[PDB]
Design an enzyme around this catalytic site. Structure first.
Site, PDB file in Angstrom:
ATOM      1  N   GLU A   1      -4.284  -8.740  -1.036  1.00  0.00           N
ATOM      2  CA  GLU A   1      -4.901  -8.574   0.219  1.00  0.00           C
ATOM      3  C   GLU A   1      -6.424  -7.914   0.428  1.00  0.00           C
ATOM      4  O   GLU A   1      -6.573  -6.614  -0.275  1.00  0.00           O
ATOM      5  CB  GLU A   1      -4.169  -7.265   1.208  1.00  0.00           C
ATOM      6  CG  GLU A   1      -4.582  -7.197   2.741  1.00  0.00           C
ATOM      7  CD  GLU A   1      -3.833  -5.958   3.245  1.00  0.00           C
ATOM      8  OE1 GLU A   1      -2.656  -5.997   3.387  1.00  0.00           O
ATOM      9  OE2 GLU A   1      -4.652  -5.193   3.746  1.00  0.00           O
TER      10      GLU A   1
ATOM     11  N   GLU B   1       0.859  -1.135   0.049  1.00  0.00           N
ATOM     12  CA  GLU B   1      -0.013  -0.005  -0.011  1.00  0.00           C
ATOM     13  C   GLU B   1       0.862   1.383   0.051  1.00  0.00           C
ATOM     14  O   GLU B   1       0.753   2.114   0.991  1.00  0.00           O
ATOM     15  CB  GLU B   1      -0.980  -0.023   1.111  1.00  0.00           C
ATOM     16  CG  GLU B   1      -1.742  -1.200   0.939  1.00  0.00           C
ATOM     17  CD  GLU B   1      -2.865  -1.479   1.830  1.00  0.00           C
ATOM     18  OE1 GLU B   1      -2.692  -0.977   3.218  1.00  0.00           O
ATOM     19  OE2 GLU B   1      -4.052  -2.168   1.937  1.00  0.00           O
TER      20      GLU B   1
END
Ligand SMILES: [Cl-]
Ligand SMILES: [Cl-]
Ligand SMILES: [Cl-]
Ligand SMILES: [Cl-]
Ligand SMILES: [Cl-]
Ligand SMILES: [Cl-]
Ligand SMILES: [Cl-]
Ligand SMILES: [Cl-]
Ligand SMILES: [Cl-]
Ligand SMILES: [Cl-]
Ligand SMILES: [Cl-]
Ligand SMILES: [Cl-]
Ligand SMILES: [Cl-]
Ligand SMILES: [Cl-]
Ligand SMILES: [Cl-]
Ligand SMILES: [Cl-]
Ligand SMILES: [Cl-]
Ligand SMILES: [Cl-]
Ligand SMILES: [Cl-]
Ligand SMILES: [Cl-]
Ligand SMILES: [Cl-]
Ligand SMILES: [Cl-]
Ligand SMILES: [Cl-]
Ligand SMILES: [Cl-]
Ligand SMILES: [Cl-]
Ligand code: NA
Ligand code: NA
Ligand code: NA
Ligand code: NA
Ligand code: NA
Ligand code: NA
Ligand code: NA
Ligand code: NA
Ligand code: NA
Ligand code: NA
Ligand code: NA
Ligand code: NA
Ligand code: NA
Ligand code: NA
Lengths: 387, 387
Positions: free
Chosen positions: A228, A139
């Site tokens: 994820e 991220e």
């Protein structure tokens, strides 16, 4: 009327597997790993690379729990990839492991970060749990107050044109693991052949943005992995929501792999290590993973043959596998028609509010590729047949 | 809220079993018999005594198909009873095997009919398939144009006061197998101790009349058996109707045994011998028969703990078995509370529109006798636990 038509001759992507993460889960037990990686048939593990200041003086203590997890999964037939959530604080512009003040990797530590990641890859290999792939960052477009590190799309390009050759000669590379699978995060890397060549897998998460195809990635030869996501709840409605998310990744996203978030870190995982109980989302994943084998290809199937029913299909090793999701509140009957193959010995397994990957003992007969079956309310059925 | 409470200390009748009839089904195959008597766990077989004019000159050809059926069931752990639909035509007031003009057994053939039935009992024994019991007549209160023979309640009394001693010294006697389980058909026999003593089992059918208790029969020490009924259809709604009928016989009727009509004679049976397919009503019966063992007693359980849910329970051999029927169109959650026993190792099996006696793999934990579970729409669940 409104058949689910399956055409084994129309092939799509190759399926690598389904899995979950051991990040921040300590050293998971044999029982947990058996539950997930043998009984449910998961076969991908995402480990975290904890920030390790001792990496260049042979101190690997920070990494030993993941080593343990990796070995357990490999012993159960799975592959392992690693994601770093941050470089060590010494390499960060904010002098910390967190995402405070949108901290990033100091360009003056680029070579050291490359060396760092190679040290983790060699650690894992040297201790008998070699990795299948390695990600550059979790991220890069989120900067929370736990392990984090920002990267812009141009920074990934900057880094890869210098250090991608070295890194990719060592291991398959995953990038960029965007929060919402933003293609802009990877487009600059993919569109420059100098950098694209170092990337093997395009990874992304599903926070905030709908699932989408990524033609550039597929057309450059890259795998597309959902690396994820999680959902809250284990009620049947949430379980079929998860099933539909996997189905959408397979079908809309053309993705080769689907990786849930953490196994046991909190109540939104797959296994509760405090009570030794399996969360019912586990069985949703198993309806895909246990039945779709090594090297299987997705094939054409009517995506939604009637309202609230979703269908995908896969072939390999002379099998056909059909995953049929009923999001409705009542049972419905559904017809299936397999084209361009001769099918026999159909068997089915159901996961629902009552059933956990349970064999139905139904007595399904197929003639000219056609069979039908009742799909219980808020359920996932997987049919497996000889083909 | 609205628990199904099970009290193992409050015991009711002993369960003999569950079964079906081979009347007019020819000589059934090993596969049919395995399906019903091994996999579904039926354990009672009702054979017909075909009218046999050669009975007193050693010609048993008319009886050989039932001999075959009887042997197959005994080899699969079952017991066998026989029902005559008519004496031979030579003993009938209408000179035929049918019920034409309300034909009955000539009182001048009473001794011969007794000898006839004893000849059938000895035939079966001599050929290695001894009977458990013998009925005097099918549906003495119906006179159709297939095998039939009328008897009034007083005729059964007339017959039994003379020939009951002889007949009962040979075999357990079932009577009267009324069309609708009319107690008036047997009351005269039960209320005279001279005749009551010759009867072991009070048998009856469920055509036209609601299920009812029979206190006189139970208070005279007699078993109460539902010896013939069928329903039309194999949809989930019909299957749960059958389940509720069995449940009502167990609970309202206090019956020791439930016996479906014919296995394969037409489309309303349990097995289709033309396609070699099992009708789904079979699995309803199996949810009782496979799990409720030898010598089990029914015990107290909340009959209907919430709307459209029906519960009964049984104990024996340190087990507790709970049969929970959901007639509703959606799944519901149901709590169970077992009193006066310590329960462990709960496992469940479901039969529904999708599942055939399928083990759920649910992970049920019991604490202080309490557990809960989701009951699929239009389904029957059987829980089995250590107790
Ligand atoms: Cl592919
Ligand atoms: Cl940890
Ligand atoms: Cl280890
Ligand atoms: Cl921020
Ligand atoms: Cl940028
Ligand atoms: Cl670009
Ligand atoms: Cl959620
Ligand atoms: Cl569990
Ligand atoms: Cl759960
Ligand atoms: Cl087939
Ligand atoms: Cl099956
Ligand atoms: Cl079936
Ligand atoms: Cl009893
Ligand atoms: Cl026949
Ligand atoms: Cl034989
Ligand atoms: Cl009549
Ligand atoms: Cl009378
Ligand atoms: Cl009376
Ligand atoms: Cl009916
Ligand atoms: Cl079948
Ligand atoms: Cl059927
Ligand atoms: Cl327990
Ligand atoms: Cl179970
Ligand atoms: Cl469970
Ligand atoms: Cl259901
Ligand atoms: Na795999
Ligand atoms: Na695998
Ligand atoms: Na911040
Ligand atoms: Na995240
Ligand atoms: Na923040
Ligand atoms: Na698999
Ligand atoms: Na199969
Ligand atoms: Na029995
Ligand atoms: Na038995
Ligand atoms: Na008539
Ligand atoms: Na009848
Ligand atoms: Na008539
Ligand atoms: Na039994
Ligand atoms: Na059990």
């Amino acid at each position: 009327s409104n058949d689910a038509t399956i055409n084994v001759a129309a092939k799509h992507q190759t399926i690598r597997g389904f899995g979950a993460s051991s990040a921040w889960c300590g050293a998971l037990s044999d029982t947990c790993m058996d539950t997930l990686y043998k009984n449910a048939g998961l076969d991908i593990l995402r480990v975290r690379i904890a920030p390790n200041e001792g990496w260049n003086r042979g101190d690997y203590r920070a990494w030993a729990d993941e080593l343990s997890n990796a070995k357990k999964v490999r012993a159960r037939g799975g592959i392992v990839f690693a994601t770093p959530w941050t470089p060590p604080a010494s390499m960060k512009t904010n002098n910390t492991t967190t995402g405070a003040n949108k901290g990033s990797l100091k360009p003056s530590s680029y070579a050291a970060y490359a060396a760092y990641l190679k040290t983790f890859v060699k650690y894992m290999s040297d201790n008998g749990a070699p990795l299948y792939a390695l990600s550059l960052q979790n991220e890069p477009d989120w900067a929370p107050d736990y392990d984090a590190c920002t990267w812009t799309a141009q920074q990934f390009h900057d880094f890869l044109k210098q250090y991608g050759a070295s890194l990719s000669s060592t291991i398959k590379i995953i990038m960029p693991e965007s929060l919402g699978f933003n293609p802009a995060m990877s487009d600059p890397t993919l569109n420059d052949p100098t950098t694209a060549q170092y990337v093997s897998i395009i990874g992304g998460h599903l926070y905030g943005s709908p699932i989408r195809d990524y033609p550039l990635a597929r057309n450059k030869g890259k795998d597309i992995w959902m690396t994820e996501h999680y959902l809250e709840g284990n009620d049947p409605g949430t379980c079929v929501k998860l099933a539909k998310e996997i189905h959408d990744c397979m079908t809309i996203g053309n993705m080769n792999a689907y990786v849930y978030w953490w196994i046991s870190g909190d109540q939104n995982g797959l296994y509760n290590t405090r009570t030794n109980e399996t969360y019912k989302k586990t069985y949703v994943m198993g309806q895909f993973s246990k039945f779709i084998g090594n090297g299987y290809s997705r094939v054409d199937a009517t995506n939604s043959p009637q309202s609230n029913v979703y269908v995908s299909a896969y072939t390999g090793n002379n099998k056909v596998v059909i995953v049929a999701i009923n999001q409705g509140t009542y049972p419905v009957n559904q017809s299936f028609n397999v084209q361009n193959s001769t099918v026999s010995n159909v068997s089915s397994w159901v996961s629902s509010g009552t059933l956990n990957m349970a064999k139905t003992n139904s007595n399904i007969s197929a003639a000219n590729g056609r069979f039908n079956a009742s799909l219980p309310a808020q359920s996932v059925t997987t049919f497996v047949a000889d083909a």
